[PDB]
Amino acid sequence: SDPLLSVLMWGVNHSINELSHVQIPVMLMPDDFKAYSKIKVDNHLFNKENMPSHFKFKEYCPMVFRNLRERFGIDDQDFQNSLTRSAPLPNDSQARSARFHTSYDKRYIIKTITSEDVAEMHNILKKYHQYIVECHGITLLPQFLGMYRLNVDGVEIYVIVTRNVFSHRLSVYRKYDLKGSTVAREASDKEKAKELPTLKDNDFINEGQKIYIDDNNKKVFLEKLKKDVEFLAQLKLMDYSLLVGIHDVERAEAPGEFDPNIDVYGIKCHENSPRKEVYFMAIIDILTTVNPEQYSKRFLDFIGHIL
Amino acid sequence: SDPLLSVLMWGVNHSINELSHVQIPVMLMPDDFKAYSKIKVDNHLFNKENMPSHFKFKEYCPMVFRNLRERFGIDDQDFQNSLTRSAPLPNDSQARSARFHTSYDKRYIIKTITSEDVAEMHNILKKYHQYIVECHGITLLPQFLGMYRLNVDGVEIYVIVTRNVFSHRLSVYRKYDLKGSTVAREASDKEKAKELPTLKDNDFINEGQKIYIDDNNKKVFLEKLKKDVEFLAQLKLMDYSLLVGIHDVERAEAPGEFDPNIDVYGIKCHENSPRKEVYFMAIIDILTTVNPEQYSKRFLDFIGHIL
Numbered sequence A, B: 001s002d003p004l005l006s007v008l009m010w011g012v013n014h015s016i017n018e019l020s021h022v023q024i025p026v027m028l029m030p031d032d033f034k035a036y037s038k039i040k041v042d043n044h045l046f047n048k049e050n051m052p053s054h055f056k057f058k059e060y061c062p063m064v065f066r067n068l069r070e071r072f073g074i075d076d077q078d079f080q081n082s083l084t085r086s087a088p089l090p091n092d093s094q095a096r097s098a099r100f101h102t103s104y105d106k107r108y109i110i111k112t113i114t115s116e117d118v119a120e121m122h123n124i125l126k127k128y129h130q131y132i133v134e135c136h137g138i139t140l141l142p143q144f145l146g147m148y149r150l151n152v153d154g155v156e157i158y159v160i161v162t163r164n165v166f167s168h169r170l171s172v173y174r175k176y177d178l179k180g181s182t183v184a185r186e187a188s189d190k191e192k193a194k195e196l197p198t199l200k201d202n203d204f205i206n207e208g209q210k211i212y213i214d215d216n217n218k219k220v221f222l223e224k225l226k227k228d229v230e231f232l233a234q235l236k237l238m239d240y241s242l243l244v245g246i247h248d249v250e251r252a253e254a255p256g257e258f259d260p261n262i263d264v265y266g267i268k269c270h271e272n273s274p275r276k277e278v279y280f281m282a283i284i285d286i287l288t289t290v291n292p293e294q295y296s297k298r299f300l301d302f303i304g305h306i307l
């Protein structure tokens, strides 16, 4: 139906098949971070039912994102399947300026970004990759899995693919987006009316939300969060959130258990939790008085407070 | 190695995969005969080992050639395999103005043609297709299976794929190219020095070559040949040949037998043949005092004479 979506599927499929024939070395070279592949298709009086007649697809830094996908435990054939076997679905939460889709198997998020975001991604990509190498892919940062430019009849859009913070199986009933902002930050009364609303710093403090995780999990989490946010501060990045999803095992009734190699952000509640819960927490949205260094401290203070 | 060959393989592979997703109706529409699909690829600092960095691939009338392939008993998946699993090999006989390749499994011939040949193919394609429908694909005419334009760094070439006249298994030890020309037509003394030489009308009359086929096979063959050549005359085509290949079952030692659904042009010798032979005969090269109407009669007179 959506031709821009059909071009994405076609292009991801094309991209992965091309790479399937490439010898993948253990290392990237500097030029890999400046590389791209472009395809321009023109069908005249042919194949009108499946594809736009005229479209372009561009993949940025194919070798870098192939390297990242493997580092994040993602097999190319699986990634291809998740994005092409059936169409991605549009989804509830957003902030248009921006359209979100989820892969059909709920493993990946596809976000539409600006050309300025693309330029910033290129700017930080090497440092990001080096950070991912240093931590062996154990991080709360968004996992950037692919970045693309699509052209269909006058319309150009840029797309980034990331890992879903939430489980691909275990449904989430409650969702928070936290910054630790000194300035008052709350969901509006029209916002709370949403089905799965994106609640914020005030809603969390207001409704006395607690997260019941044991001491070891909390320390591990916060240690990771500390390194990640300092890296972000170092890059002068800000306006990022901690996304928090809560799975209620009671409401849902593998009976409340998750695959930690797929749902990488999952943390089980401790044994004395008022309710059987699984949390899914990760950093999102990194690409944009309040300065990065301060923002970094504010964010970390608040998160340590709420755990 | 040969980048133009690698682009062909890449493009045929691409073409067949695209069509694999198309609903194929039983009929062609007029626009199918004017259709094409174009792909332009630009790789910057990427994938230098497998492909040229910059290339174009164009397929003419994809639906028509898909329809023809099925009419000629050829499955798209098989055709794809024959042309992509391993590289086509360059081959002995030619006439440069023109490079020939054979598919690795010896099922298909790939000939390089001019843009004027491409223009003439478009001119006759509908009438050709209609002729193929009328005879249910039972014909000695070349079987046109695909036509393409390749671009690699300044070099543009046009390619047509046809069925090999000869067997994909049974080797041929002797080869003739016959026109029935009133003007003397012979292989040169430098030509006969070739390993598998392309002998001609004089060599055949000179060396008293006989073809030992029974009366029914001869009549069937000549009846077909009659209709085919009249069709060609009707299109004002000329300078076409009967290609004759001879398989010697003795020299070769399925013990001398062939699959008639693959080696469609094969005709076994009759029981009293001085030697166990299989012949492979078909019309080739149709795309260009001596006028088409006369040429047609001359050609038919000579061929009926030699059988």
Ligand SMILES: Nc1ncnc2c1ncn2[C@@H]1O[C@H](COP(=O)(O)OP(=O)(O)NP(=O)(O)O)[C@@H](O)[C@H]1O
Binding pocket: A093, A094, A095, A096, A098, A100, A109, A111, A162, A163, A164, A165, A166, A175, A177, A198, A239, A243, A284, A285
């Ligand atoms: N990786 C992810 N997994 C699951 N949900 C996500 C993910 N990223 C974003 N979302 C959802 O989409 C919403 C918006 O994400 P975000 O990337 O902040 O969009 P944005 O348009 O950049 N918003 P803003 O902060 O106003 O710039 C979030 O609150 C989540 O509900």
Ligand SMILES: Nc1ncnc2c1ncn2[C@@H]1O[C@H](COP(=O)(O)OP(=O)(O)NP(=O)(O)O)[C@@H](O)[C@H]1O
Binding pocket: B093, B094, B095, B096, B098, B100, B109, B111, B162, B163, B164, B165, B166, B175, B177, B198, B239, B243, B284, B285
């Ligand atoms: N379908 C085929 N199967 C097997 N061999 C072929 C086939 N087509 C051509 N050849 C071989 O290639 C030679 C030249 O074929 P042809 O298509 O006549 O080339 P050309 O360059 O058009 N020659 P000319 O008659 O001088 O214009 C033939 O004599 C055969 O040996």
Ligand SMILES: [Mn+2]
Binding pocket: A239, A240, A241, A284, A285
């Ligand atoms: Mn955000």
Ligand SMILES: [Mn+2]
Binding pocket: A285
């Ligand atoms: Mn944002």
Ligand SMILES: [Mn+2]
Binding pocket: B239, B240, B241, B284, B285
């Ligand atoms: Mn010829």
Ligand SMILES: [Mn+2]
Binding pocket: B285
């Ligand atoms: Mn010719």
